[PDB]
mmCIF file with all atom_site columns, C-alpha atoms in Angstrom:
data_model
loop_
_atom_site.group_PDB
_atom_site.id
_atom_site.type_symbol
_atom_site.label_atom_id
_atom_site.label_alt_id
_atom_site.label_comp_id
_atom_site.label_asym_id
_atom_site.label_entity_id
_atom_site.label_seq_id
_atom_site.pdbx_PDB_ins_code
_atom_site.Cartn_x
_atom_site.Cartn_y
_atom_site.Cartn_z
_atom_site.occupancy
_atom_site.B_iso_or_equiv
_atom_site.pdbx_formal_charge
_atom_site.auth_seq_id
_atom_site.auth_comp_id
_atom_site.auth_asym_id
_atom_site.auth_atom_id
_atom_site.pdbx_PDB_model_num
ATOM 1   C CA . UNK A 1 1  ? -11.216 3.577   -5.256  1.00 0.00 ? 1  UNK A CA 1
ATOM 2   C CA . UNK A 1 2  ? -8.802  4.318   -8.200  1.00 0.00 ? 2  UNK A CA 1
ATOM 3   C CA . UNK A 1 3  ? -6.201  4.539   -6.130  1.00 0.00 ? 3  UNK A CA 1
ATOM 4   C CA . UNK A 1 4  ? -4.731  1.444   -5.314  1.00 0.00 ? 4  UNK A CA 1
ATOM 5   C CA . UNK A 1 5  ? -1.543  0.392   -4.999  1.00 0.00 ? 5  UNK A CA 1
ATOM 6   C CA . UNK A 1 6  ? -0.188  -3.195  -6.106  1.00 0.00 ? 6  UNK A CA 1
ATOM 7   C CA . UNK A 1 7  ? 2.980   -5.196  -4.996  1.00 0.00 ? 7  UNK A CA 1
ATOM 8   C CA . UNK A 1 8  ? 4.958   -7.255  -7.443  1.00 0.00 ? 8  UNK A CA 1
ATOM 9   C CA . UNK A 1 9  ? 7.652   -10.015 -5.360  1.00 0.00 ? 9  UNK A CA 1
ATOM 10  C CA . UNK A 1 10 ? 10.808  -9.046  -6.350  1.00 0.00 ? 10 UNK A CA 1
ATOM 11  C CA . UNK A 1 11 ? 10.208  -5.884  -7.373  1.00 0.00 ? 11 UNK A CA 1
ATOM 12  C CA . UNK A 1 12 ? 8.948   -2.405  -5.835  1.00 0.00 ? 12 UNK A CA 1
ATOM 13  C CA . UNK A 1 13 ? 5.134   -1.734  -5.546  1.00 0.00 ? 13 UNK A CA 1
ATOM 14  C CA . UNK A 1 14 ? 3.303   0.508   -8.410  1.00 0.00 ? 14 UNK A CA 1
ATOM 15  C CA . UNK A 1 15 ? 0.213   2.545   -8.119  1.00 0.00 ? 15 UNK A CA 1
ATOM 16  C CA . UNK A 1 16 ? -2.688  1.471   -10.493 1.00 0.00 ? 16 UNK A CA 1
ATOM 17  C CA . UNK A 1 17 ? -5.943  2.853   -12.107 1.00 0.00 ? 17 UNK A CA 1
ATOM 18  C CA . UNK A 1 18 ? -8.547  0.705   -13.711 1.00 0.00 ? 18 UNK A CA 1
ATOM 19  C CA . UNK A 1 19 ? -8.848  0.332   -17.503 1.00 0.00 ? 19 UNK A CA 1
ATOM 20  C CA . UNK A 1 20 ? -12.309 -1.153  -16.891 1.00 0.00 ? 20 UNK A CA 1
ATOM 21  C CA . UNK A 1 21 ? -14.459 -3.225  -14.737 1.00 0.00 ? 21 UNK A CA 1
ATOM 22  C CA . UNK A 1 22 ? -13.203 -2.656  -11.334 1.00 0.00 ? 22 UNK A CA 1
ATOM 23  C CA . UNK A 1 23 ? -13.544 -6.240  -10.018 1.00 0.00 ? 23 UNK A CA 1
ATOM 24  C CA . UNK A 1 24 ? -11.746 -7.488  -13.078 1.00 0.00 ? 24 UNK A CA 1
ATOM 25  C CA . UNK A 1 25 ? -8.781  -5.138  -12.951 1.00 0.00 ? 25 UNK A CA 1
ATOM 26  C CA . UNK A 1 26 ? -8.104  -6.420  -9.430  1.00 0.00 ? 26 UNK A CA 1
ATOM 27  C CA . UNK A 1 27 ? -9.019  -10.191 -10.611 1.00 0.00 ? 27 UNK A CA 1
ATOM 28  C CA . UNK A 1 28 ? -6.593  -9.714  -13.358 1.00 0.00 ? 28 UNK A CA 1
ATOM 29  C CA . UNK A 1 29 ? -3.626  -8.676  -11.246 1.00 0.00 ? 29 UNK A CA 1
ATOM 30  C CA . UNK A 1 30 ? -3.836  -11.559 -8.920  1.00 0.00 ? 30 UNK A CA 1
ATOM 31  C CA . UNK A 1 31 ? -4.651  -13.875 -11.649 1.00 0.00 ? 31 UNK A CA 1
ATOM 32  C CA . UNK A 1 32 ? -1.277  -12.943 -13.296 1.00 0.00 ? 32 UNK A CA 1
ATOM 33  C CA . UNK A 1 33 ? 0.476   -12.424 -10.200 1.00 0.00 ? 33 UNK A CA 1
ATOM 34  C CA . UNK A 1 34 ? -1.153  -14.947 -8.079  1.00 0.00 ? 34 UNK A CA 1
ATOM 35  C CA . UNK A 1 35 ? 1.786   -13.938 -5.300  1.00 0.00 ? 35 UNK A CA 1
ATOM 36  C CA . UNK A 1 36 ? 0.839   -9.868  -5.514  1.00 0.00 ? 36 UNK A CA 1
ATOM 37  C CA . UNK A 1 37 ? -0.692  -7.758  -2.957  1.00 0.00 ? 37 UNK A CA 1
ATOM 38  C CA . UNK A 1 38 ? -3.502  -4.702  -3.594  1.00 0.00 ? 38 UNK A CA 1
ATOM 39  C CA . UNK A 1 39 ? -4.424  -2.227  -1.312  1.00 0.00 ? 39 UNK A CA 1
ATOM 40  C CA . UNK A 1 40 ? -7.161  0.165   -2.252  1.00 0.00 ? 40 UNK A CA 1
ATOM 41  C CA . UNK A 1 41 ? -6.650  3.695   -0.824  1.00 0.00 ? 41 UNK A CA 1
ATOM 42  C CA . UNK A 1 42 ? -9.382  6.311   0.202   1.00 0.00 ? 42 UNK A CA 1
ATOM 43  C CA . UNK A 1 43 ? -9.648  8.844   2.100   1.00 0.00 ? 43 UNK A CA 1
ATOM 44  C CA . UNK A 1 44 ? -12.589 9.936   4.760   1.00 0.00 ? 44 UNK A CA 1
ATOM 45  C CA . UNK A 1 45 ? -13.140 12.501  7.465   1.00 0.00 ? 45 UNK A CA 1
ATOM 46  C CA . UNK A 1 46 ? -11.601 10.992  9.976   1.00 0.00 ? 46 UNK A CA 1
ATOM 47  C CA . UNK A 1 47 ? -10.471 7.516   9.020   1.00 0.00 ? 47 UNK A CA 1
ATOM 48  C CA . UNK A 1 48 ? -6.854  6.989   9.856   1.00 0.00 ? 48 UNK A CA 1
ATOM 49  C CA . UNK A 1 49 ? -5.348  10.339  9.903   1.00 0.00 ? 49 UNK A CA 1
ATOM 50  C CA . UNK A 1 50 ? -7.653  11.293  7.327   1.00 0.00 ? 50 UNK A CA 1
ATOM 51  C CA . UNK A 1 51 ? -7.466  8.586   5.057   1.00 0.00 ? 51 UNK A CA 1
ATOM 52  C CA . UNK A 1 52 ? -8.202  4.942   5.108   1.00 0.00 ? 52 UNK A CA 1
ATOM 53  C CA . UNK A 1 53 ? -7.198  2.025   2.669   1.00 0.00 ? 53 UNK A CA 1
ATOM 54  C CA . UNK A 1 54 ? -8.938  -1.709  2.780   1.00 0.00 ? 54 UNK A CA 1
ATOM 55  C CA . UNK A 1 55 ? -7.593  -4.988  1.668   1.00 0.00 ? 55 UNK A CA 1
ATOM 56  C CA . UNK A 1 56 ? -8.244  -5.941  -1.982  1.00 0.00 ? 56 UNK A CA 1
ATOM 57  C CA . UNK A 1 57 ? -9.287  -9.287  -0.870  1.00 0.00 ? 57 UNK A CA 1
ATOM 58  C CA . UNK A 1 58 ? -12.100 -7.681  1.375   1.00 0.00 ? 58 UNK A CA 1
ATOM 59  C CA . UNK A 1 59 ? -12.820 -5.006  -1.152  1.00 0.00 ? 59 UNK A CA 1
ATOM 60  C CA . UNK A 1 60 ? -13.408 -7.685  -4.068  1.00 0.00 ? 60 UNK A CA 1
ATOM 61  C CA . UNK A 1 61 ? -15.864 -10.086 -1.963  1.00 0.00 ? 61 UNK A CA 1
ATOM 62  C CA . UNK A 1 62 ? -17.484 -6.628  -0.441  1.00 0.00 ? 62 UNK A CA 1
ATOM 63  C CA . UNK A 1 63 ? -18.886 -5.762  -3.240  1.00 0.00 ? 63 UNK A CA 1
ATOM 64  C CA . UNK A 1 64 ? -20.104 -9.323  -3.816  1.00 0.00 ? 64 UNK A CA 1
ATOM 65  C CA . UNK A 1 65 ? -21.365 -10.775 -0.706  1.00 0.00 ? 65 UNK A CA 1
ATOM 66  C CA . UNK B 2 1  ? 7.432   9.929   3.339   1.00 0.00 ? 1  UNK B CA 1
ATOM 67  C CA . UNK B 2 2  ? 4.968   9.965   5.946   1.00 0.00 ? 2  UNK B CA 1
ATOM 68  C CA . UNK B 2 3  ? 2.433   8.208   3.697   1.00 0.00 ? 3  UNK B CA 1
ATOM 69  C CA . UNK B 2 4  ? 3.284   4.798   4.432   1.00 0.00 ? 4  UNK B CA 1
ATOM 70  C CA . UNK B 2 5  ? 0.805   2.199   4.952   1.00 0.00 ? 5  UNK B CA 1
ATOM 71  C CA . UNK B 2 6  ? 1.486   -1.654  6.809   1.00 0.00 ? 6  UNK B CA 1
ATOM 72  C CA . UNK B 2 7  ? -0.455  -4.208  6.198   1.00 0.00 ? 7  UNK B CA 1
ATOM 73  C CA . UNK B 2 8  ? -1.085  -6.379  9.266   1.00 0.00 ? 8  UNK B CA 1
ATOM 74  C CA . UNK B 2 9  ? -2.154  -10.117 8.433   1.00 0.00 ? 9  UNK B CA 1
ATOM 75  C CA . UNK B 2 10 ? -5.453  -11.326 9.034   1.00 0.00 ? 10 UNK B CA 1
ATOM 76  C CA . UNK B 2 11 ? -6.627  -8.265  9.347   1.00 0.00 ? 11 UNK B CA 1
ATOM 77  C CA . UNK B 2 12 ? -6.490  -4.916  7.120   1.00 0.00 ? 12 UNK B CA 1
ATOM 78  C CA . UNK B 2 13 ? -4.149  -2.754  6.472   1.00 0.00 ? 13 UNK B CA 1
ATOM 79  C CA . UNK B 2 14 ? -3.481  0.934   7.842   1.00 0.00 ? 14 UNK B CA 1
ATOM 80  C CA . UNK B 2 15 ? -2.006  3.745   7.306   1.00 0.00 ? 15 UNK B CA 1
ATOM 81  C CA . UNK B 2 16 ? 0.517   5.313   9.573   1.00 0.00 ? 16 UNK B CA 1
ATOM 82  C CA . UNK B 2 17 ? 2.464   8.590   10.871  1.00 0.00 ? 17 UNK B CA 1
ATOM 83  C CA . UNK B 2 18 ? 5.874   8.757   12.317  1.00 0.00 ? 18 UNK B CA 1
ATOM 84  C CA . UNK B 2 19 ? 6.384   9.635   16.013  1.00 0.00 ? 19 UNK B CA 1
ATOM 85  C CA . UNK B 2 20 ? 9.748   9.745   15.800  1.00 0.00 ? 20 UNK B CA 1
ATOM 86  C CA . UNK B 2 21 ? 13.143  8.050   14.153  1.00 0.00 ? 21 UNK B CA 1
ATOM 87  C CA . UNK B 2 22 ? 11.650  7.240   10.669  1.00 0.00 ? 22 UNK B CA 1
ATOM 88  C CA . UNK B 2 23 ? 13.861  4.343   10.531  1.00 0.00 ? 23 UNK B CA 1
ATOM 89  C CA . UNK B 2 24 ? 13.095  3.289   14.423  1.00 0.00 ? 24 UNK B CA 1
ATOM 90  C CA . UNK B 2 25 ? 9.230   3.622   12.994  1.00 0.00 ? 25 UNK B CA 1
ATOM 91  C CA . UNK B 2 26 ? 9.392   1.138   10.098  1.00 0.00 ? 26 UNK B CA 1
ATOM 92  C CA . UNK B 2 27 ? 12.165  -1.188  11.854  1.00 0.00 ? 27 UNK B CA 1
ATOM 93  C CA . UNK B 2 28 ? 9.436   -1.320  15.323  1.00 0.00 ? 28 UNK B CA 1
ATOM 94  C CA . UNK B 2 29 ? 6.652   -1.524  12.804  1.00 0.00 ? 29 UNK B CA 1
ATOM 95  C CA . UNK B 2 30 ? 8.795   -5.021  11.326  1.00 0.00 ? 30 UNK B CA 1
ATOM 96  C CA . UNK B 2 31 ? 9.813   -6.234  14.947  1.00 0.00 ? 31 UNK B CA 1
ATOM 97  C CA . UNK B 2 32 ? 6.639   -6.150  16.577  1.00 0.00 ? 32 UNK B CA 1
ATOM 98  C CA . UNK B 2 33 ? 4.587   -8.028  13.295  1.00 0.00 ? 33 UNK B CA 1
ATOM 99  C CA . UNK B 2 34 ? 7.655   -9.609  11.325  1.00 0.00 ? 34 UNK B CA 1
ATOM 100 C CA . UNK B 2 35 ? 4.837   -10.537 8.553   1.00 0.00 ? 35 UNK B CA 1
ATOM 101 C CA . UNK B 2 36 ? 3.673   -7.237  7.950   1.00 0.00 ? 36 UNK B CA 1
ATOM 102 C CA . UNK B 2 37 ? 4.190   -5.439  4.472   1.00 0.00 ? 37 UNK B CA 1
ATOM 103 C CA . UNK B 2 38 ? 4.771   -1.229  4.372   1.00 0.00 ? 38 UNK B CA 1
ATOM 104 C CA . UNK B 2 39 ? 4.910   0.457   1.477   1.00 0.00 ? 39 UNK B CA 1
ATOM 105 C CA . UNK B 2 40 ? 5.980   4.140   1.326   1.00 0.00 ? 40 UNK B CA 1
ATOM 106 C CA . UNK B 2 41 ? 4.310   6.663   -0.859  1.00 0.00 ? 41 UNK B CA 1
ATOM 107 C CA . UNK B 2 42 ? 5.220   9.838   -2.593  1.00 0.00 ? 42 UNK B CA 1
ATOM 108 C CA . UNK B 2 43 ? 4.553   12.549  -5.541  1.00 0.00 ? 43 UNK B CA 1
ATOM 109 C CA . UNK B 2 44 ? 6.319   12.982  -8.241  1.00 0.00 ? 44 UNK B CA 1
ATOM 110 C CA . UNK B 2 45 ? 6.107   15.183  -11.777 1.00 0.00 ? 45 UNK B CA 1
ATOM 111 C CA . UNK B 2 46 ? 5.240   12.131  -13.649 1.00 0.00 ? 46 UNK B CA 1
ATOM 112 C CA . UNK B 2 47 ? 6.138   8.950   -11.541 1.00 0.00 ? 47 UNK B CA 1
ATOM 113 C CA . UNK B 2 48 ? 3.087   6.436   -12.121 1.00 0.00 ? 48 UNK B CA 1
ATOM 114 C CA . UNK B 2 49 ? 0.212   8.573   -12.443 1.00 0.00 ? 49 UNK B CA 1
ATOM 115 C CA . UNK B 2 50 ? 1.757   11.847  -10.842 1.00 0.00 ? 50 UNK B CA 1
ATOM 116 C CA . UNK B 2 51 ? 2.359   9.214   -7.675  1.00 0.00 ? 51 UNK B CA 1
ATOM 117 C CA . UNK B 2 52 ? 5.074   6.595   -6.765  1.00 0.00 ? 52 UNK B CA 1
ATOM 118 C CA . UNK B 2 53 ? 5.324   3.961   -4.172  1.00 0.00 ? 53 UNK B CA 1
ATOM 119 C CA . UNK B 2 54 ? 8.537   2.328   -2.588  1.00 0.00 ? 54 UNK B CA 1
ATOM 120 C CA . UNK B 2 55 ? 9.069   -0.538  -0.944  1.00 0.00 ? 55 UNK B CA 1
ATOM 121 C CA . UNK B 2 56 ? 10.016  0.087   3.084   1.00 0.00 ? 56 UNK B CA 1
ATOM 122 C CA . UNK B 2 57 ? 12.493  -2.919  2.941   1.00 0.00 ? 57 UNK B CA 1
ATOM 123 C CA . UNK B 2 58 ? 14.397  -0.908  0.177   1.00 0.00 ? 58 UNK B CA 1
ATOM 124 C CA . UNK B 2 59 ? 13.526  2.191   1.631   1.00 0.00 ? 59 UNK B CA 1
ATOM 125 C CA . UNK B 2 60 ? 15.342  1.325   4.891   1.00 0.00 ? 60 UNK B CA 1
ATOM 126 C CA . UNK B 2 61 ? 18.424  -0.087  3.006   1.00 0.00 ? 61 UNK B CA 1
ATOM 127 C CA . UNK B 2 62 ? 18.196  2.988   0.848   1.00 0.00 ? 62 UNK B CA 1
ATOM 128 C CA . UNK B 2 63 ? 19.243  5.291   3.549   1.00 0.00 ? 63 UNK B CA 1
ATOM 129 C CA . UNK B 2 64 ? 21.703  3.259   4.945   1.00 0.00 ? 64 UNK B CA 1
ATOM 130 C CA . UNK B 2 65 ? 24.026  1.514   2.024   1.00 0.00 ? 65 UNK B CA 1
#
């Protein structure tokens, strides 16, 4: 969940951890950077090679609706 | 290096092992879905929270030129 990594145009992508509310720190990065991309990394027992990541997008209205 | 994950649009993203030619992997990855987005991670002493990220589109160039 806290590992996430988000892609400024331009520039090369950084990996982020939240300073707060979850669903704001992800709001607040596309709010400033209307243009950038999230994924949120995981990891699970079998997932994808033993790890999985979902779509910001998905993740912020998952937890909503 | 083999934690990269591609981002296929419309849908979510995964994360992916190479099975062969690292730059053949990330090049097919680009042919075959010309809109998707990889990003390349790694470990580092300090990096951005003992992690680091690059983007594959530098990452191929990087090898190269």
């Amino acid at each position: 969940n806290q590992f996430l990594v988000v892609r400024h145009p331009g520039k090369t992508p950084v990996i982020k951890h939240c300073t707060g509310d979850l669903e704001e720190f992800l709001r607040q990065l596309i709010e400033q950077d209307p243009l950038v991309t999230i994924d949120i990394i995981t990891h699970r027992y079998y997932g994808v090679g033993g790890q999985w990541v979902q779509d910001a997008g998905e993740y912020l209205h998952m937890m909503s609706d």
